[PDB]
């Protein structure tokens, strides 16, 4: 049997416009433990992108942290995108500075 | 003090074609990861994952590594065992899990002990905690059990989770005790976002707590809300410490009405945050 | 520290 992922994606410190700062892709509650995870600036896949070692939870589920720095702007877009097994086509989390 | 737990996650994963399944143990103590060993490398060997560890000599290192290795190989045949049992393709990626291991009380004595494997994410077998008797979960698992039944491995194992597991355990808490009792307090503000009509939405924060068990509440006039109170899970900022928010709809004007607690095991008591308008 | 897991 194969478990859907939930994602967040959300800044390391709050953002302010300007000021580096690292965005977080943080996914959760997967299997299997096979899974793709880019994250974008603007439609464009960014191409630094560190992963960190993956886990499991005491349900057997998988998750992962993927980051990357980034400098928060005020139009700038920022999503993540997570492509699993568990899914028809791939799943988008776009990034709100207020959550 | 508190109760103490000694832990390994391990995960073999088949990708055929590909090449050898890949093989992962992951120690924790605490629910802290302290040791890894990760197939996918040259010269794979266990390694520390918590400086304090780095206290154990090339001696122990050593001999984690080829334990770990030869329980690699193991799974690697549990994988092919398993398409067996369950009549599956040669083709597909499969996976196994186990969980085992020891917690023990303030006195240093064995709580409870355990170990249970899955397949492809779900449950396969299990060491009652009668540590004695197993309950397999479905049809092939039965198979292992009177197998490892007709071996007398619920007492070998019973030595493992009582003695070295609980032993090591002691060792282990010995030379980390003190980074493992660590603690960051959070760090917790309000924000103030609108909404539609006559309605604003009221956000706490709590930022840079270490560890991650936390609570929010948001109270009108002392209360708890409970109902439509909207939250996200505890979250990882990336540098060991932990992020949480909860967040109430309220009504235009009546801000000041609303409180919102922080209840973490680093503060002396818990934080009281309302909304303020610079 | 860690065991030798049987086989299944």
Known sequence: IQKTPQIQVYSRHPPENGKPNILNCYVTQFHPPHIEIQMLKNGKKIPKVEMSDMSFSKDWSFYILAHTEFTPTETDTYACRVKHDSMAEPKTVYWDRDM | ?278 | YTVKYPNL
Not at chain 2, 32 to 40: M, P
Not at chain 2, 101 to 111: A, F, I, M, Q, T
């Open chain 2, 1 to 278: 003090m508190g109760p103490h737990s000694l832990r390994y996650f391990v995960t073999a994963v088949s990708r055929p074609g590909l090449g050898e399944p890949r093989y992962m143990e992951v120690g924790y103590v605490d629910d802290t990861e302290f040791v890894r060993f990760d197939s996918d490398a040259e010269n794979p060997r266990y390694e520390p994952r918590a400086r304090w560890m780095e206290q154990e000599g090339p001696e122990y290192w050593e001999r984690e590594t080829q334990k770990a290795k030869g329980n690699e190989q193991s799974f690697r045949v549990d994988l092919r065992t398993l398409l067996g049992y369950y009549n599956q393709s040669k083709g597909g990626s499969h996976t196994i899990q186990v969980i085992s291991g020891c917690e023990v009380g303030s006195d240093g004595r064995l709580l409870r002990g355990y170990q249970q494997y899955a397949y492809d994410g779900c449950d396969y077998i299990a060491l009652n905690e009668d540590l004695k008797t197993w309950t397999a979960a479905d049809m092939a698992a039965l198979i292992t059990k009177h197998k490892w039944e007709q071996a007398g491995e619920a007492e070998r194992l019973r030595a493992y989770l009582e003695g070295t597991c609980v032993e090591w355990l002691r060792r282990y808490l010995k030379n980390g005790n003190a980074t493992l009792l660590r603690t960051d307090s959070p760090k917790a503000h309000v924000t103030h976002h609108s909404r539609p009509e006559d309605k604003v939405t009221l956000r706490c924060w709590a930022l840079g707590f270490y560890p991650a068990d936390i609570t929010l509440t948001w109270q009108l006039n002392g209360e708890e809300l409970i109902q439509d109170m909207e939250l996200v899970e505890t979250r990882p900022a990336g540098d060991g410490t932990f992020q949480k928010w909860a967040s109430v709809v309220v009504p235009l004007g009546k801000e000041q009405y609303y409180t919102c607690h922080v209840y973490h095991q680093g503060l002396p008591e818990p934080l009281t945050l309302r909304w303020e308008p610079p």
